[PDB]
Symmetry: D2
Subunit: 298 residues, 4 copies
């Protein structure tokens, strides 16, 4: 029930000096809302939270929540390694008017299970907002297993969902059976574009995926088709989404690629990104372009 | 060769409210310098850099460098995921009087090899201090391979060493043969207590390891015995260091364990640690104590 | 394009003394062929090749080829760690009448790339039969990357396909774009049930998956529906396949589970399995049964 | 304590046609016994067990036991993935007069813990010989944890040791503390040359390592020096053993390297290896030679 459907992890647009580009972030927000998304997620991996300072993250969230102005539910990513900062950023998000926070597990130290449960319990106790967990074991080095997530949802009634970013049908399936089986309204969202369709067929709730920035219409139409019972139309959109993640191989981090994609699909924003990411080179931008053209996305 | 010998990663002592405990950190620094260490390293993993804000880190470094007062070479850990903050903290360290900085690879995104080389070169070019790399793949999920380290030392003459924190004889051997083979004065330090002896026999330069906090005499005497040609005496100290790391299994993070050991070995400092670390329980503190007694360290 | 469509990895039926159960394996083969499969694959992981001796494997292959009697194409798994034995089994297979061989990479030693290419080239040179590569990195510890596989298909014109057994959309998608892009008639089959549909939509050719033994009709009808352009009907069958692999968690190895399922779905065969696999306990058999009933498969 | 001290995993010498070279294997066995080793281990990873058929393995063990003629204790490696074959090879070893068997875990399927404990209990019940376990998780993909090993020693009184092949001080220390702490006469042997000294200082029992083939005097003298209380002398030998494993990087599998080193150090045996290993090229042979010369081994 909370935060279901298509919720893009919005890119943060920066100027050439690495300050928040308010007109470009605002235009991107407005494109997304006009495309019919179900909510917006700021300061996720795509939004570059890990390359920003805490004061910067507060300013971005505040701007973003204000610009959205309640048109769609807003989530703010408040996680990191500094747990005291995670509480600060989460309390700031609630005060600023966000609808929910998304909290990754600490990704430097892989803390013991007892420390990890305590960390999420404390973060959840610091706010009255709904809390979405964030699994990204390829970057964190520490999986949030279905059993662990179930124990968290048993322990705190404001822990109401998960963004599960993993290329694994078994992990999504098992997350759904174990957690939604005990908690029917717990939300399961996949973090990869090419798992949206399977997520839905498995009993999950939608996606928070990078292609939400530059082709939201494909995910939004997939979901609308699926909700209407037109499974073949849904499967047609899925065939596009199956191919999209090729582009993510172009660079790592690929936050540059997603911005270059937003431009190519018709929204001229500054593509600047924060170190240690770097501008995409021209030959790879052309490769991105041919991929987008083959998929009829620009 | 810069920063060789025994260089503890000093614990940061905090009060119950999580603020820097100045008298306790100072007492700890003084004990360590009296024990005959060759340098001090503040805000490494043991010093809890990843649970501290940037302004807290600057304050800690400033205090520590000031208290040390040039009695031994001082290293400051400046790394993180936010590269702009890395440059800020590194430039701050230089201006505050540090003798070198210690920079881990970004540990959220495992960035491409080209972004990674470009990150270290930018960090190096932001200061005129010597730079020590920090490899801790168990936590980062991205190894700094001997071939990669060699390429950084070939590219920047102020990248002069590495702290290699890995339980692997092969990795230390290869780091020494590959990098010290091209760069005879490049410093190789192990990050685990039980690899100090082998690092020395391999042609490496010493250790930055946690037991430096609570039993610096063991490492210090091992290096002295080694430098004196008394290999059997060195090997006797090694036998104690082989056993110490058992304690690190008592909790994760084990920064709490290191502080509880500082107290048990005779220095009564506050043992508070920052979340998501937590206080060590009384039964595990009793287990630590009986271990320190069996090793004759208290 | 050779060996496309639905090709079960057939269980080998054994008696209570661990000998080939000819009547039971024959009835299983017959059920499968009547179900409309496009081929049959004996002595894969599911047929227990790794628990059988070389003479046992020759006997089983000969029986199975003779029983099939050319009704559908027959593949024999001839791989292992003993490369001399792989050539013996492969030449035996050809002499006995098989239509192709399936060859995993060596899975004890992960051999260097040069030795690996040389191994597959020698195997491929030993027979005139088509050769299907078998990638199962969860078990082998050594992935057959799309680049490597392309190199092998460039090198030997009888290396014509791959069974790719990995819960990874990216791996499938990349195998298809890289290998089929250079070699349009190179066959890509997925080894997991719940990747069949995606495999088809990505441009691949079918599946060799365990549920082919006890519910072939689901895969067969999915392929038929897809080939007819009835995508929604295909997606219906996909919804069942998405759920089936839950049963594989019951035991490891789960070759017992597969045989227990064959019985439950209406083919009473001896379920004996070779050590170190063991009989499935009754509570887990009942668990399997409830999973089959929920999916309307018995 | 059974099977302690220096026990080489003997290379199996083959003729150009891949048959057992009896004069060369015999000469190698005699060289080893003359050098003062404490036992000999045939058909481990370096003896190429995984590239041999069962009838070949039997012939080799029979020959090797017979040649040794009880001058030193003899171990035979009997493991594989075919558990019925493991029992046949182990009962054959006993009947052929072996003193013990060495049994790796199944390395294709990583069987469930319950299947793994049953496997080892069944193998141990099939003979009245002592059984040494063999941990090689880089190749097996499944670690024998100290806890699991303790459970096996609690379960069967003829499971009396382990060959722990892993570049990990923690793994050795923990195997010693957990297993030898419950079972003081259980034998812990390391499988890598550069962990012999540490294994001894940790309370362990010796090494089964590749350099036993071509330079057994180094391990033999280290152990002698250690037993004599001349720790400095032991450490001098350790310094050579720290350097030897560089050569194992020359090829993979490196069984070819080990035989080229046997020749270079003065015993002219055939260096044929079984596929998928291959002959070492001349430039790498010249590299191995200069390494052996720098270490004063030829
Ligand atoms: C989330 C979206 C996921 O994690 C990306 O990896 C691409 O789909 C995010 O926070 O950026
Ligand atoms: C360095 C010491 C290493 O990393 C620890 O893991 C323990 O010896 C540090 O910066 O803490
Ligand atoms: C192939 C089928 C694959 O590998 C299994 O893992 C089950 O889908 C086989 O050879 O058994
Ligand atoms: C044992 C020795 C180990 O496993 C090698 O890796 C080299 O010391 C063996 O059986 O070969």
């Amino acid at each position: 029930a909370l935060f279901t459907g298509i919720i893009p992890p919005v890119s943060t647009i920066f100027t050439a000096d690495g300050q928040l580009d308010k007109p470009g972030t605002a235009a991107l927000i407005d494109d997304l809302i006009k495309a019919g998304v179900d909510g917006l997620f700021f300061l996720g991996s795509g939004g570059e939270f890990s390359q920003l300072g805490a004061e910067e993250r507060k300013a971005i969230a505040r701007f973003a929540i204000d610009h959205v102005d309640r048109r769609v539910p807003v989530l703010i990513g408040t996680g990191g390694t500094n747990a005291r900062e995670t509480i600060e950023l989460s309390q700031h998000a609630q005060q600023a008017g966000a609808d929910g926070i998304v909290v990754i597990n600490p990704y430097y130290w892989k803390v013991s299970e007892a420390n990890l449960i305590r960390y999420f319990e404390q973060v959840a106790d610091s706010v009255t907002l709904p809390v979405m967990l964030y699994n990204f074991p390829a970057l964190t080095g520490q999986d949030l297993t279905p059993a662990l997530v179930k124990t968290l949802a048993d322990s705190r009634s404001n822990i109401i969902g998960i963004k599960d970013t993993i290329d694994s049908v078994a992990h999504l399936r098992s997350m759904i059976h174990t957690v939604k089986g005990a908690h029917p309204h717990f939300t399961v969202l996949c973090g990869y574009d090419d798992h949206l369709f399977n997520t839905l067929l498995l009993g999950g709730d939608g996606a928070i995926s990078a292609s939400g920035n530059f082709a939201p219409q494909v995910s939004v139409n997939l979901l609308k088709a699926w909700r209407d019972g037109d499974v073949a139309k849904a499967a047609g959109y899925h065939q596009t989404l199956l191919q999209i993640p090729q582009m993510y191989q172009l660079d790592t981090p690929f936050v540059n690629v997603i911005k270059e994609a937003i431009v190519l699909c018709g929204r001229p924003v500054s593509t600047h990104v924060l170190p240690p990411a770097s501008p995409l080179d021209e030959p790879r931008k052309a490769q991105l372009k041919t991929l987008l053209q083959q998929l009829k996305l620009c």
